Amino acid sequence: MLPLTLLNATQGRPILVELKNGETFNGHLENCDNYMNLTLREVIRTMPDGDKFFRLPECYIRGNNIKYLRIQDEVLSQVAKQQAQQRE
Amino acid sequence: MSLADFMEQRVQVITNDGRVVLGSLKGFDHTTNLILSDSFERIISMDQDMETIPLGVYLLRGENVAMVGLVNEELDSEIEWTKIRGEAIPDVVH
Amino acid sequence: TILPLELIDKCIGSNLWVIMKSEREFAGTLVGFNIVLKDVTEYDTVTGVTEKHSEMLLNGNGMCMLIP
Amino acid sequence: MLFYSFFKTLIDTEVTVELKNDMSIRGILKSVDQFLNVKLENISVVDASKYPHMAAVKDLFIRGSVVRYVHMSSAYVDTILLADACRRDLANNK
Amino acid sequence: NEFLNKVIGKKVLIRLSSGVDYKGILSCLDGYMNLALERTEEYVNGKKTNVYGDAFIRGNNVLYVSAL
Amino acid sequence: SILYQDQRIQATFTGGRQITGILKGFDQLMNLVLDDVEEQLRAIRKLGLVVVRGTTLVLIAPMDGSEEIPNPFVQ
Amino acid sequence: EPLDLVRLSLDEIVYVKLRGDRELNGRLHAYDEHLNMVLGDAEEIVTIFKALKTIRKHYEMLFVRGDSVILIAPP
RNA sequence: UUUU
């Protein structure tokens, strides 16, 4: 399964993003591209020491700064089910 | 890639910030982006017992991936990771 | 709207202030563009040390902001 | 392609990869690609008591961008042929 | 880029992002700012630390080239 | 481009610099022209009219509706 | 054309300064446009921090990834 | 805008 296929399938769903600088972003994935640039909606930004928190209506994140994304198990399940039916 | 050799098996990723995360390799691409499922992080230290954090589905951007090891199930069964101590893995310095 | 590089192109011959991602700045007369600056002052914004340059080629990779 | 080709000739021989996080891993080179990503088999971490994390890993993928060095026995390198290949690569790139 | 002609063959100061300085005659320059110098002196904390008879400097490290 | 004109935005750069300003232009590489810029120091300083280089951006968000909140996560 | 300097060092001993307070002296047998290199009979000097100590190691054959290279000179 |  390709990673960008999974990322595109989590559009519309909650997501957790951690950046190289150590900040984390919790929000709904509104859109993404093959650069892994993200636009998120209704976001909580957490500073690196877990000290301070901001609410952002939406935000844009450059993909080159992402360390990793956390995605719900059901998204992975959905993509696997669709690919295994597309096989037939 | 040679990573195709590891598909659908338990794998242990060392990232550029020194973290250790284990999980099932569900996919990768030519930049070494990875999908791990049923993943968890292991924090081995010298001062305290090993911590295990559950992570679920984990998409790792390849830029941040240093190593991907295939975990040998028998070797890992022989090890009691609870009582294991070790140094923090250093950060990658470019 | 306005186009960043058209604004910078407008700045040729005028004074430009450049802010790096690191704590360094340069201020000089923009010659062209990686940018060439003339009669430049380099500022280390942590140590406070300042240095002068008659003319220099500034690598563009580390520049954050350009300010007319 | 010069160093990708060079590393292919070292497949099946023992190498030590020093990484930019100061870990070094010894093992049999099994695979290499255009990025100089490398796959080692039957690895042993050089300072294993410092880094017990890979005690259950035998096969290992290393991303090419995190390599500092690969060092290898001179016995499997023909430096006359290597230098000639280098000159032909430079000429091809002219 | 009339800077090049004005600078190739004359003494230059090269500052790396790390802060280490190299002074020497500039043999050659390219788009990534890879340099070749002819008798380089290296300065760390401002002190002369090494002398190289010729030097290739990899451009990703170069912060600037300034004329002397 | 998956992404404010004349609205005030906040931007974060690799290396940590953090600024706000009114978006007055942009291009496809995501260079920005921001006016009335203020840099948040690591307190503020005022930079006026700035061109930001898109390659150094990490984050862009609108200022309207952005607020500091207390910890929202269940301990 | 800068790389022509390194062309003149093929099969000659070079000094290489690397990021991370590391230095190499060895015989250049191959390089490419990234400054990937293979050195034969190489000595590495690692400086540990005024220096606290230096560590010297010898390698019969050594591939060096180019992105660590700061400069290349005669020894 | 991920491995020079």
Coordinates of C-alpha atoms (C1' of nucleotides) in Angstrom, one line a residue:
Chain A
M1 CA 0.0 0.0 0.0
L2 CA 1.5 3.4 -0.9
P3 CA 1.9 5.9 1.9
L4 CA 0.3 8.7 -0.1
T5 CA -2.6 6.5 -0.9
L6 CA -3.2 6.1 2.8
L7 CA -2.7 9.8 3.4
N8 CA -5.2 10.7 0.7
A9 CA -7.6 8.3 2.2
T10 CA -7.5 10.0 5.5
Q11 CA -8.8 13.3 4.0
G12 CA -11.9 14.3 5.9
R13 CA -10.7 12.4 9.0
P14 CA -8.8 13.4 12.2
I15 CA -5.0 13.2 12.0
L16 CA -2.1 13.8 14.3
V17 CA 1.1 15.5 12.8
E18 CA 4.4 15.8 14.4
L19 CA 7.0 18.2 12.8
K20 CA 10.8 18.2 12.9
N21 CA 10.7 21.2 15.3
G22 CA 8.8 19.0 17.8
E23 CA 5.4 20.7 17.6
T24 CA 2.3 18.5 17.1
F25 CA -0.9 19.4 15.3
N26 CA -4.2 17.7 15.9
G27 CA -6.8 18.4 13.4
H28 CA -9.0 17.3 10.5
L29 CA -7.1 16.6 7.2
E30 CA -8.7 18.9 4.7
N31 CA -6.3 18.3 1.8
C32 CA -2.9 17.0 0.9
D33 CA -0.6 16.8 -2.1
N34 CA 2.2 14.5 -3.3
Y35 CA 4.7 16.8 -1.5
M36 CA 2.9 15.8 1.7
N37 CA 1.9 19.4 2.2
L38 CA -1.2 19.4 4.5
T39 CA -4.1 21.8 5.1
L40 CA -5.9 21.0 8.4
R41 CA -9.1 22.3 9.8
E42 CA -10.0 22.9 13.5
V43 CA -6.5 22.4 14.8
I44 CA -4.7 22.2 18.2
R45 CA -1.1 23.2 17.9
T46 CA 1.1 21.9 20.8
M47 CA 4.5 23.5 21.4
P48 CA 7.5 21.2 21.8
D49 CA 7.6 21.0 25.6
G50 CA 3.9 20.3 25.8
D51 CA 3.7 23.5 27.8
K52 CA 1.5 25.7 25.6
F53 CA -1.4 25.1 23.2
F54 CA -3.2 27.1 20.5
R55 CA -6.4 26.6 18.6
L56 CA -6.3 27.4 14.9
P57 CA -9.4 27.4 12.7
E58 CA -7.2 26.0 9.9
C59 CA -3.5 25.9 8.9
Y60 CA -1.1 24.9 6.1
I61 CA 1.9 22.7 6.9
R62 CA 4.8 22.2 4.5
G63 CA 5.4 18.5 4.0
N64 CA 9.2 18.8 4.2
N65 CA 8.8 19.6 7.9
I66 CA 6.8 16.5 8.8
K67 CA 8.3 13.7 10.9
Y68 CA 5.3 11.5 11.0
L69 CA 1.5 11.3 10.9
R70 CA -0.8 9.2 13.0
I71 CA -4.0 7.9 11.3
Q72 CA -7.0 6.0 12.6
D73 CA -7.0 2.2 12.2
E74 CA -10.2 2.3 10.3
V75 CA -8.6 4.3 7.5
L76 CA -6.0 1.6 6.9
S77 CA -8.8 -1.0 7.1
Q78 CA -10.9 0.9 4.5
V79 CA -8.0 1.2 2.0
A80 CA -7.1 -2.5 2.4
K81 CA -10.7 -3.5 1.9
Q82 CA -11.1 -1.3 -1.2
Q83 CA -7.8 -2.6 -2.8
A84 CA -8.6 -6.2 -2.1
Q85 CA -12.0 -5.8 -3.8
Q86 CA -10.5 -3.9 -6.7
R87 CA -8.3 -7.0 -7.2
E88 CA -11.6 -8.7 -8.0
Chain B
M1 CA 13.1 -1.8 -2.8
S2 CA 15.0 -4.2 -0.6
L3 CA 12.2 -3.0 1.8
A4 CA 9.8 -5.1 -0.3
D5 CA 11.6 -8.0 1.4
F6 CA 10.2 -6.8 4.8
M7 CA 6.5 -6.3 3.6
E8 CA 3.8 -7.5 6.0
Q9 CA 6.3 -8.4 8.7
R10 CA 7.3 -6.9 12.0
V11 CA 9.9 -4.3 11.5
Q12 CA 11.8 -1.9 13.8
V13 CA 12.5 1.6 12.6
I14 CA 15.2 3.9 13.9
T15 CA 14.4 7.5 13.1
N16 CA 16.7 10.5 12.8
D17 CA 15.7 11.8 16.2
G18 CA 16.8 8.5 17.8
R19 CA 13.4 7.0 18.4
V20 CA 12.7 3.2 18.1
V21 CA 9.3 2.2 16.7
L22 CA 8.1 -1.3 15.9
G23 CA 5.2 -2.4 13.7
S24 CA 4.0 -4.2 10.7
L25 CA 5.3 -2.8 7.4
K26 CA 2.2 -2.2 5.3
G27 CA 3.9 -0.1 2.5
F28 CA 6.7 2.2 1.4
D29 CA 7.6 4.3 -1.5
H30 CA 10.8 5.5 -3.3
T31 CA 11.5 8.2 -0.7
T32 CA 11.3 5.7 2.1
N33 CA 8.0 7.0 3.5
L34 CA 6.7 4.0 5.5
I35 CA 3.3 2.8 6.8
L36 CA 3.5 0.8 10.1
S37 CA 0.4 -0.7 11.7
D38 CA -0.1 -2.0 15.2
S39 CA 3.0 0.0 15.9
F40 CA 4.5 1.1 19.2
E41 CA 7.5 3.1 20.4
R42 CA 10.1 1.6 22.7
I43 CA 12.0 3.8 25.0
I44 CA 15.1 2.0 26.3
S45 CA 17.2 4.1 28.7
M46 CA 19.8 3.5 31.4
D47 CA 18.1 5.1 34.3
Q48 CA 14.6 3.4 34.1
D49 CA 12.9 0.3 32.7
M50 CA 11.8 0.2 29.1
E51 CA 8.6 2.2 28.2
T52 CA 6.3 1.0 25.5
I53 CA 3.9 3.6 23.9
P54 CA 1.1 2.3 21.6
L55 CA 1.0 4.3 18.3
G56 CA -1.6 2.5 16.1
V57 CA -1.1 3.4 12.4
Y58 CA 2.1 5.4 11.8
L59 CA 3.1 7.1 8.6
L60 CA 6.8 8.0 8.8
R61 CA 8.2 10.5 6.3
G62 CA 11.3 8.9 4.7
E63 CA 13.5 11.9 5.3
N64 CA 13.3 11.0 9.0
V65 CA 14.0 7.3 8.6
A66 CA 17.5 6.1 9.4
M67 CA 17.2 2.3 9.5
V68 CA 14.5 -0.3 9.0
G69 CA 15.4 -3.7 10.7
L70 CA 13.5 -6.9 10.3
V71 CA 12.7 -8.2 13.8
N72 CA 13.6 -11.9 14.1
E73 CA 10.7 -13.4 16.0
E74 CA 12.7 -16.1 17.7
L75 CA 15.5 -13.8 18.8
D76 CA 13.0 -11.3 20.1
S77 CA 11.1 -14.1 22.0
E78 CA 14.4 -14.9 23.8
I79 CA 14.8 -11.3 25.0
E80 CA 13.2 -9.9 28.1
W81 CA 12.9 -6.3 27.0
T82 CA 11.4 -5.2 30.3
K83 CA 14.7 -5.4 32.2
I84 CA 16.7 -4.0 29.3
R85 CA 18.8 -0.8 29.7
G86 CA 20.8 1.1 27.1
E87 CA 21.9 4.5 25.9
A88 CA 19.6 6.8 24.0
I89 CA 20.3 6.4 20.3
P90 CA 21.9 9.7 19.2
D91 CA 20.3 12.1 16.7
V92 CA 21.3 12.0 13.1
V93 CA 23.6 15.1 12.5
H94 CA 23.7 16.1 8.9
Chain C
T1 CA -2.2 41.0 -5.6
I2 CA 1.6 41.5 -5.7
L3 CA 4.4 39.2 -6.9
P4 CA 7.3 38.7 -4.4
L5 CA 10.0 38.4 -7.1
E6 CA 8.7 41.4 -9.0
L7 CA 9.0 43.4 -5.8
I8 CA 12.5 42.2 -5.3
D9 CA 13.3 43.0 -8.9
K10 CA 12.0 46.5 -8.2
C11 CA 14.5 46.6 -5.3
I12 CA 17.6 46.4 -7.6
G13 CA 19.9 49.4 -6.9
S14 CA 18.0 50.1 -3.7
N15 CA 18.9 49.1 -0.1
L16 CA 17.8 45.6 0.9
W17 CA 17.7 44.0 4.4
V18 CA 18.1 40.3 4.5
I19 CA 17.2 38.1 7.4
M20 CA 18.6 34.5 7.5
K21 CA 16.9 31.6 9.2
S22 CA 19.9 31.7 11.5
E23 CA 20.5 34.7 13.7
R24 CA 22.3 36.6 11.0
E25 CA 21.3 39.6 8.9
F26 CA 22.8 41.5 6.0
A27 CA 21.9 45.0 4.9
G28 CA 23.3 46.5 1.7
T29 CA 22.6 47.8 -1.8
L30 CA 21.0 45.1 -3.9
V31 CA 23.0 44.5 -7.1
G32 CA 21.3 41.4 -8.5
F33 CA 20.3 37.9 -8.0
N34 CA 21.7 33.7 -4.7
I35 CA 22.0 37.5 -4.4
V36 CA 24.8 40.0 -5.0
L37 CA 24.9 42.9 -2.5
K38 CA 27.2 46.0 -2.5
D39 CA 28.3 48.1 0.5
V40 CA 27.0 45.5 3.0
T41 CA 26.8 45.4 6.8
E42 CA 26.7 41.9 8.3
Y43 CA 25.1 41.6 11.7
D44 CA 25.5 38.6 14.0
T45 CA 22.3 39.1 16.1
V46 CA 23.3 36.9 19.0
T47 CA 26.9 38.1 19.6
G48 CA 26.2 41.6 18.3
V49 CA 29.3 41.6 16.1
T50 CA 29.1 43.7 13.0
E51 CA 31.3 43.5 9.9
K52 CA 31.5 45.4 6.7
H53 CA 31.9 44.2 3.1
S54 CA 32.5 46.1 -0.1
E55 CA 30.7 43.6 -2.3
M56 CA 29.6 40.0 -1.8
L57 CA 27.7 37.0 -3.3
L58 CA 25.2 35.8 -0.6
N59 CA 24.1 32.2 -0.9
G60 CA 20.3 32.2 -1.2
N61 CA 19.7 28.8 0.6
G62 CA 19.7 30.3 4.1
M63 CA 17.7 33.5 3.5
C64 CA 14.4 33.8 5.3
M65 CA 13.1 37.3 4.5
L66 CA 14.0 40.1 2.1
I67 CA 12.9 43.6 3.2
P68 CA 13.0 46.7 0.9
Chain D
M1 CA 25.9 5.1 -11.4
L2 CA 29.6 4.9 -10.5
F3 CA 29.2 4.2 -6.8
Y4 CA 26.0 2.2 -7.2
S5 CA 28.0 0.0 -9.6
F6 CA 30.9 -0.2 -7.2
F7 CA 28.7 -1.2 -4.3
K8 CA 27.1 -3.9 -6.5
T9 CA 30.5 -5.5 -6.9
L10 CA 30.7 -5.7 -3.0
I11 CA 27.4 -7.6 -2.6
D12 CA 28.1 -10.8 -0.6
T13 CA 31.2 -9.3 1.2
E14 CA 31.4 -8.0 4.7
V15 CA 31.1 -4.2 5.1
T16 CA 30.8 -1.8 8.1
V17 CA 28.4 1.2 7.6
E18 CA 29.1 4.1 9.9
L19 CA 26.0 6.3 10.2
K20 CA 25.5 10.0 10.9
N21 CA 24.2 9.2 14.4
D22 CA 27.6 7.6 15.2
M23 CA 26.2 4.0 15.2
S24 CA 28.2 1.5 13.1
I25 CA 26.7 -1.7 11.7
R26 CA 28.7 -4.6 10.4
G27 CA 27.1 -7.2 8.0
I28 CA 27.0 -8.8 4.6
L29 CA 26.0 -6.4 1.9
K30 CA 23.0 -8.0 0.1
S31 CA 21.6 -5.1 -1.9
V32 CA 22.2 -1.5 -3.0
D33 CA 20.1 1.0 -5.1
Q34 CA 20.5 4.2 -7.0
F35 CA 20.2 6.2 -3.8
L36 CA 22.9 4.0 -2.2
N37 CA 20.3 2.8 0.3
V38 CA 21.9 -0.5 1.5
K39 CA 20.6 -3.8 2.8
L40 CA 22.9 -5.7 5.2
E41 CA 22.3 -9.3 6.4
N42 CA 23.3 -11.0 9.7
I43 CA 24.2 -7.6 11.1
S44 CA 25.9 -7.0 14.4
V45 CA 26.0 -3.5 15.9
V46 CA 29.6 -2.6 16.6
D47 CA 29.1 -1.5 20.2
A48 CA 26.2 -3.7 21.0
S49 CA 26.2 -3.1 24.7
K50 CA 25.8 0.6 24.0
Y51 CA 22.9 -0.2 21.7
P52 CA 21.1 -3.4 22.7
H53 CA 18.1 -2.2 20.6
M54 CA 18.9 -4.3 17.6
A55 CA 19.5 -7.7 19.4
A56 CA 16.5 -9.1 17.5
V57 CA 17.4 -7.7 14.1
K58 CA 19.4 -9.8 11.6
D59 CA 18.5 -8.1 8.3
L60 CA 18.7 -4.3 8.1
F61 CA 17.9 -1.6 5.6
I62 CA 19.9 1.6 5.9
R63 CA 18.8 4.8 4.1
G64 CA 21.6 6.1 1.9
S65 CA 21.3 9.7 3.2
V66 CA 22.2 8.7 6.8
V67 CA 25.5 6.9 5.8
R68 CA 28.7 8.7 6.7
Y69 CA 31.1 5.9 5.7
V70 CA 31.2 2.4 4.4
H71 CA 34.5 0.7 5.0
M72 CA 35.4 -2.6 3.5
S73 CA 38.3 -4.9 3.0
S74 CA 40.7 -3.8 0.3
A75 CA 40.8 -7.4 -0.8
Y76 CA 37.6 -7.1 -2.8
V77 CA 38.4 -3.7 -4.4
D78 CA 40.6 -3.4 -7.6
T79 CA 41.7 0.2 -7.3
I80 CA 43.2 0.3 -10.8
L81 CA 39.9 -0.8 -12.3
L82 CA 38.0 1.5 -9.9
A83 CA 40.0 4.6 -10.9
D84 CA 39.6 3.7 -14.6
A85 CA 35.8 3.4 -14.1
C86 CA 35.9 6.8 -12.4
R87 CA 37.7 8.4 -15.4
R88 CA 35.2 6.9 -17.8
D89 CA 32.3 8.1 -15.6
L90 CA 33.7 11.7 -15.6
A91 CA 34.3 11.6 -19.3
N92 CA 30.7 10.4 -19.9
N93 CA 29.5 13.3 -17.7
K94 CA 31.4 15.9 -19.8
Chain E
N1 CA 26.4 38.5 -12.3
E2 CA 29.3 40.8 -13.3
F3 CA 30.4 40.0 -9.7
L4 CA 32.2 36.9 -11.1
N5 CA 34.5 38.7 -13.5
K6 CA 35.2 41.3 -10.8
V7 CA 36.2 38.5 -8.4
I8 CA 37.7 35.5 -10.2
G9 CA 41.4 35.7 -9.9
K10 CA 41.5 38.1 -6.9
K11 CA 41.6 37.5 -3.1
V12 CA 38.3 36.7 -1.5
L13 CA 36.9 35.9 1.9
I14 CA 34.6 32.8 2.1
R15 CA 32.4 32.5 5.1
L16 CA 30.9 29.1 5.8
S17 CA 27.5 28.9 7.6
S18 CA 29.5 27.3 10.4
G19 CA 31.3 30.6 10.8
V20 CA 34.8 29.4 9.6
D21 CA 36.5 31.8 7.2
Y22 CA 38.8 31.0 4.3
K23 CA 40.8 33.7 2.5
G24 CA 42.5 33.0 -0.8
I25 CA 42.6 33.7 -4.5
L26 CA 39.4 32.4 -6.2
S27 CA 40.2 30.0 -9.0
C28 CA 36.7 29.1 -9.9
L29 CA 33.0 29.2 -8.9
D30 CA 29.8 27.5 -10.0
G31 CA 26.1 27.7 -9.6
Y32 CA 26.0 25.7 -6.3
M33 CA 28.7 28.0 -5.1
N34 CA 31.3 25.2 -5.1
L35 CA 34.7 27.0 -5.0
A36 CA 38.2 26.4 -6.0
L37 CA 40.8 28.6 -4.2
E38 CA 44.6 28.9 -4.8
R39 CA 46.3 29.4 -1.4
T40 CA 43.7 29.2 1.3
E41 CA 44.1 30.4 4.9
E42 CA 41.5 29.1 7.3
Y43 CA 40.4 31.2 10.3
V44 CA 38.4 29.9 13.3
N45 CA 37.3 32.3 16.0
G46 CA 39.1 34.8 13.8
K47 CA 42.5 33.1 14.3
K48 CA 44.6 31.6 11.4
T49 CA 44.3 27.8 12.0
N50 CA 45.4 26.2 8.8
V51 CA 47.0 26.9 5.4
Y52 CA 46.0 24.8 2.3
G53 CA 48.0 25.0 -0.9
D54 CA 44.7 24.6 -3.0
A55 CA 41.2 24.1 -1.9
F56 CA 37.9 22.8 -3.2
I57 CA 35.1 23.9 -0.9
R58 CA 31.7 22.3 -1.2
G59 CA 29.1 25.0 -1.9
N60 CA 26.3 23.8 0.4
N61 CA 28.5 25.0 3.3
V62 CA 29.2 28.5 1.8
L63 CA 27.4 31.4 3.4
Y64 CA 29.0 34.0 1.2
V65 CA 31.9 35.1 -1.0
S66 CA 33.1 38.7 -0.3
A67 CA 35.7 40.5 -2.3
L68 CA 38.8 42.0 -0.7
Chain F
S1 CA -1.3 24.5 -4.8
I2 CA -3.6 23.1 -2.0
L3 CA -3.5 26.6 -0.5
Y4 CA -6.1 34.8 2.9
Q5 CA -5.5 37.9 0.7
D6 CA -5.5 41.1 2.7
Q7 CA -6.1 39.0 5.9
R8 CA -3.6 38.8 8.7
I9 CA -1.7 35.6 8.9
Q10 CA 0.9 34.0 11.1
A11 CA 3.9 32.2 9.7
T12 CA 6.6 30.0 11.1
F13 CA 10.0 29.4 9.5
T14 CA 12.5 26.6 9.8
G15 CA 14.9 27.7 12.5
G16 CA 12.1 28.9 14.7
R17 CA 11.4 32.5 13.5
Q18 CA 7.7 33.3 13.9
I19 CA 6.0 36.4 12.3
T20 CA 2.6 37.9 11.6
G21 CA 1.5 40.2 8.9
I22 CA -1.1 41.1 6.3
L23 CA -0.9 38.8 3.2
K24 CA -0.6 41.2 0.2
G25 CA 0.7 38.8 -2.4
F26 CA 2.1 35.4 -3.2
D27 CA 3.5 33.2 -6.0
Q28 CA 3.3 29.5 -6.9
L29 CA 6.6 28.6 -5.1
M30 CA 4.8 30.1 -2.0
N31 CA 7.0 33.1 -1.7
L32 CA 4.9 35.7 0.2
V33 CA 4.6 39.4 0.3
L34 CA 3.4 40.4 3.8
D35 CA 2.8 44.0 5.0
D36 CA 2.9 45.4 8.5
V37 CA 5.0 42.4 9.6
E38 CA 5.9 41.9 13.2
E39 CA 8.4 39.2 14.3
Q40 CA 7.8 37.5 17.6
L41 CA 11.2 37.5 19.3
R42 CA 12.7 34.6 21.3
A43 CA 8.1 40.6 22.8
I44 CA 8.2 41.8 19.1
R45 CA 10.1 43.8 16.5
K46 CA 8.4 45.4 13.5
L47 CA 9.7 44.6 10.0
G48 CA 7.2 46.5 7.8
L49 CA 6.8 45.2 4.2
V50 CA 8.6 41.9 3.8
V51 CA 9.2 39.2 1.1
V52 CA 9.3 35.8 2.7
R53 CA 11.0 32.9 0.8
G54 CA 8.6 30.0 0.5
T55 CA 11.3 27.4 0.9
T56 CA 11.7 28.3 4.6
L57 CA 8.0 28.2 5.5
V58 CA 6.8 25.5 7.9
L59 CA 3.5 26.8 8.9
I60 CA 0.8 29.3 7.6
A61 CA -2.3 30.0 9.6
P62 CA -4.9 32.9 9.7
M63 CA -4.8 35.0 12.9
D64 CA -8.6 35.4 13.1
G65 CA -10.0 32.8 15.4
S66 CA -6.5 31.7 16.5
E67 CA -6.1 31.8 20.3
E68 CA -4.0 30.3 23.1
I69 CA -6.0 27.7 25.0
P70 CA -5.3 25.7 28.2
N71 CA -4.3 22.1 27.8
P72 CA -7.2 20.4 26.0
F73 CA -5.9 16.8 26.4
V74 CA -7.2 14.3 29.0
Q75 CA -4.4 13.6 31.4
Chain G
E1 CA 34.9 23.8 -13.4
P2 CA 35.6 23.9 -9.6
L3 CA 35.5 20.1 -9.6
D4 CA 38.5 20.1 -12.0
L5 CA 40.6 20.7 -8.9
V6 CA 39.5 17.4 -7.5
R7 CA 40.1 15.8 -10.9
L8 CA 43.8 16.6 -10.4
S9 CA 43.9 14.6 -7.2
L10 CA 42.7 11.3 -8.7
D11 CA 45.2 8.6 -7.4
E12 CA 46.9 11.3 -5.2
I13 CA 46.8 11.6 -1.5
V14 CA 44.2 14.2 -0.4
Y15 CA 43.2 15.8 2.9
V16 CA 39.4 15.9 3.4
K17 CA 37.6 18.0 6.0
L18 CA 34.1 16.7 7.0
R19 CA 31.3 18.0 9.0
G20 CA 31.3 16.9 12.6
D21 CA 34.9 17.7 13.4
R22 CA 36.3 14.8 11.3
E23 CA 39.3 14.8 8.9
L24 CA 40.6 12.2 6.5
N25 CA 43.9 11.7 4.8
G26 CA 43.9 9.1 2.1
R27 CA 44.5 8.2 -1.5
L28 CA 41.7 9.2 -3.8
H29 CA 40.6 6.4 -6.1
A30 CA 37.2 7.6 -7.2
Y31 CA 34.7 10.4 -6.8
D32 CA 31.6 11.7 -8.4
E33 CA 29.8 15.0 -8.7
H34 CA 28.3 14.7 -5.2
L35 CA 31.9 14.3 -3.8
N36 CA 31.1 10.8 -2.9
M37 CA 34.6 9.3 -2.7
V38 CA 36.6 6.1 -2.2
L39 CA 39.9 6.6 -0.4
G40 CA 42.5 3.9 0.0
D41 CA 44.8 3.6 3.0
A42 CA 42.9 6.3 4.9
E43 CA 43.5 7.8 8.3
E44 CA 40.5 9.5 10.1
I45 CA 41.0 12.0 12.9
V46 CA 38.0 12.7 15.0
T47 CA 38.2 15.8 17.3
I48 CA 36.1 15.5 20.5
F49 CA 35.1 18.6 22.6
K50 CA 39.7 23.7 23.1
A51 CA 39.7 20.0 22.1
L52 CA 39.2 17.3 24.7
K53 CA 41.0 14.7 22.6
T54 CA 41.4 13.3 19.1
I55 CA 40.9 9.7 18.0
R56 CA 42.8 8.3 15.0
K57 CA 41.6 5.3 13.0
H58 CA 43.0 3.6 9.9
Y59 CA 40.8 2.2 7.1
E60 CA 42.2 0.0 4.3
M61 CA 39.4 1.2 2.0
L62 CA 36.7 3.8 2.7
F63 CA 33.7 5.2 0.9
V64 CA 32.7 8.7 2.1
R65 CA 29.3 10.1 1.3
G66 CA 29.7 13.4 -0.4
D67 CA 27.2 15.4 1.7
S68 CA 29.6 15.3 4.7
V69 CA 32.5 16.9 2.7
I70 CA 33.4 20.5 3.6
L71 CA 36.7 20.8 1.8
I72 CA 39.3 18.8 -0.2
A73 CA 43.0 19.9 -0.3
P74 CA 46.5 18.5 -0.8
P75 CA 47.7 16.8 2.3
Chain H
rU1 C1' 9.5 20.3 -0.9
rU2 C1' 12.1 13.5 1.4
rU3 C1' 18.5 10.3 -0.7
rU4 C1' 24.0 14.7 -1.8

